Structures are given as C-alpha cells and as structure tokens.
C-alpha cells in the first residue's frame, strides 16, 4: 500500500560512511517545502545528522503530508535506515 508517497534525496556536501552501528537507522524530522515549490514538484534542502540533503519533493503536494525515504536514513554497510520527512507547506 502507499501508505507514504515514494520520495528521494541527494546528500548536498552532506558525509556518510560504512554505518550499520546501530544508533537510530531511521530518523524523524520536518520538511520546509515553498508552496511553489510544491505544486510543481521540486527539490527542498533538508537538515539532517549527515549534513545538508536536497529532497525531491512530488508534483502537487499538500501540507500535512508525510515522506519516508527508504534506503536513505543513517549509512549501512549492505542496505540504509529510512528518514521520515513530515512535509510542511512553507
């Protein structure tokens, strides 16, 4: 089910590693997305424990809306955490 819709980023300057140490693979943060910049769908920065992550936001978003990019939370060796973005239309 979608349950969340199907979101992306790109680390912009943003430093990972070989992780799968444990700590939090998934994190829980809050997404400053221009109202723009949602209706046409395109990318926010996000801060994150990683550093500065720029998040493809989908064409036409509502506020109250929630994003999981999954492969893309804290480093792992075989596979990533998720971040959990909840998109607040700025």
Request: proline letters at 9%; hydrophobic letters at 35%.
């Amino acid at each position: 089910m979608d349950d969340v819709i199907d979101a992306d980023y790109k680390p912009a300057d943003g430093s990972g590693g070989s992780g799968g140490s444990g700590g939090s693979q998934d994190l829980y943060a809050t997404l400053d997305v221009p109202a723009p910049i949602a209706v046409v769908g395109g990318k926010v920065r996000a801060m994150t424990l990683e550093g500065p992550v720029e998040v493809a936001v989908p064409p036409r978003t509502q506020a109250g809306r929630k994003l999981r990019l999954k492969g893309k939370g804290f480093p792992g060796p075989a596979g990533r955490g998720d971040l959990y973005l909840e998109v607040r239309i700025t």
